[PDB]
């Protein structure tokens, strides 16, 4: 009946947690989920919840939803203004559902290595493993233009702690047989340009978001690692010192930066935090300052379905007005959680060294 709203320092870690392809939602069909849904009923707010038909203030972490209850809600709320959130949700899902089960697979080849073979790579080296990139999952819609967020998610369970430990074998075949793989960063800062940027990869697009001005297929880019072959001039023996990346990377055991792929998914690459962590945690790398404009509609939107000093007294100096406009000032140094800033710092070999146009998997040494 009396309803308000929230602090707005509940309102960035919101826009972390969602962005993270992370909100719980409640369905009208399916309750409490995040799966499949054409509309999302009242949303989370951190520890806050909000029915999203007055967007009001309704509930709290020790609170718990079980039914719909009745309070005066202004139903002037159209759920068109804000599908783009579960779009991206979905987006979220799908991608990293993919990084899984390609990872799987990955390991999957990895371990079928013989030592006649591995003591090759330590007799000659060379690439071991032989994958097309035409088994990428088209089920998926980075890989089918007609897949789609409008499509049912099969659901997963335990993506984390599996990423974790699919990774953990890899650094651990990486630094222990030494290999120099499809996958290495020194810094990713400069991708999309900053490689040499060749041939009708050049299609290759990069907002930083999501938008239904694209869906997101595309091959998946490789340097030129095929030189070395090529060349007699820069194989084992050579890279027997600089090439493989642990040098940089230094100790895996030991580990105070990231680790991160060739670009490949979601138009990206992306980033693994270190063992010093505690976990190897893949991180799609972003920037926020379009994260900021997404509210540039409920603004407003509020601005009228909400009073002058209640709102005044709700958000900081300007209201919501100032509030944006400040927030804006602030986003990309606050907005930032510093997994973002867990890069490194070395690098004797440079990053100027091959184009990056679509190949397949494969790895050598």
């Known amino acids: 009946m009396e ?16 962005f993270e392809g992370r909100v719980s939602i409640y369905s009208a069909q399916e309750g409490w989920d995040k799966t499949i849904s054409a509309q999302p009923d009242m949303m989370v707010c951190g520890g806050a919840v909000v029915c999203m038909h007055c967007l009001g203030v309704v509930g709290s972490l ?15 709320i159209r759920h068109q203004d804000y599908v783009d959130v579960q779009f991206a949700d979905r987006v979220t899902a799908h991608w990293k559902r993919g990084m899984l089960s390609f990872v799987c697979q990955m390991h999957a080849m990895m371990n079928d290595v013989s030592p006649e073979d591995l003591d090759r790579v330590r007799t000659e080296g060379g690439s071991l493993v032989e994958l097309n990139w035409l088994q990428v999952d088209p089920n998926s819609m980075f890989r089918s233009i007609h897949s789609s967020w409008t499509d049912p998610l099969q659901v997963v369970d335990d993506l984390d702690t599996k990423l974790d430990q699919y990774w953990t074998a890899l650094n651990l075949m990486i630094d222990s047989s030494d290999l120099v793989p499809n996958f290495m960063m020194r810094d990713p800062s400069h991708a999309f340009n900053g490689v040499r940027l060749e041939g009708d ?29 090529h ?9 027997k010192e600089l090439v493989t990346p642990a040098r940089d990377f230094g100790h895996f055991g030991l580990s105070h930066y990231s680790r991160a792929t060739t670009p490949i998914l979601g138009k990206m690459p992306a980033v693994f935090s ?13 920037k926020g300052t379009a994260k900021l404009k997404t509210v540039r509609k409920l603004v407003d939107s509020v601005n009228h379905a909400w009073g002058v000093e209640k709102i005044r007294y709700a958000l900081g100096p300007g209201g919501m007005t100032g509030w944006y406009n400040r927030t804006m000032q602030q986003a990309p140094i606050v907005l930032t959680p510093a997994a973002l800033t867990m890069f490194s710092d070395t690098t004797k070999f ?4 091959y184009p990056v146009m679509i190949g397949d998997p494969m790895i050598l040494g």
């Open 3 to 18: 309803v308000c709203l929230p602090n707005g320092h509940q309102i960035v870690d919101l826009i972390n947690n969602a």
């Open 62 to 76: 020790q609170r718990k939803l079980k039914h719909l209850p009745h309070h005066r809600c202004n139903q002037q």
């Open 201 to 229: 990869a050049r299609q290759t697009q990069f907002s930083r978001t999501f938008d239904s001005r694209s869906s997101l297929e595309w091959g998946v880019m490789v340097y030129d690692y095929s030189e070395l072959e």
């Open 231 to 239: 060349d007699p001039s820069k194989g084992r023996a050579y890279r």
């Open 274 to 286: 270190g063992m010093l962590t505690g976990n190897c945690k893949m991180y799609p790398f972003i």
């Open 350 to 353: 440079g990053d100027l060294d």
